[PDB]
Symmetry: none
Subunit: 70 residues, 2 copies
């Protein structure tokens, strides 16, 4: 998330914790909106998929630490 979108690690970590806790897609959207254009770019990258489902797949594949870094 940092490398590809410029998202601060602490923001990215919060987002992924929300995902893992079964938190709301709406919350995730709000936090990525608030981080600015890089967050909006990630939201757009999910495309037709929910951002939550998109990020859950990435976490399952690569682990949280790597998704944060990405």
């Amino acid at each position: 998330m940092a490398k590809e979108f410029g998202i601060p690690a602490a923001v990215a970590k919060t987002v992924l914790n929300v995902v893992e806790a079964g938190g709301w897609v709406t919350t995730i959207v709000s936090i990525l909106t608030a981080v600015g254009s890089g967050g909006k770019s990630l939201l757009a990258a999910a495309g037709r998929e929910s951002i939550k489902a998109y990020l859950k797949k990435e976490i399952k594949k690569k682990g949280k630490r790597a998704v944060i870094a990405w």
Copy 2:
């Protein structure tokens, strides 16, 4: 929130928007908990006072920008 509790600004903004919208204490709790230790510490700083009421009072005292900053 950012300087005293390490709540990233994007997350802090999201939290204050929930507060302003009159959203749920449980949602404020889960977002702050997702931040990690600094979020948990902000929750502890509120004591027995509703986190929502607590942050509303902080906004009344300092304004939204300064609450985010803190």
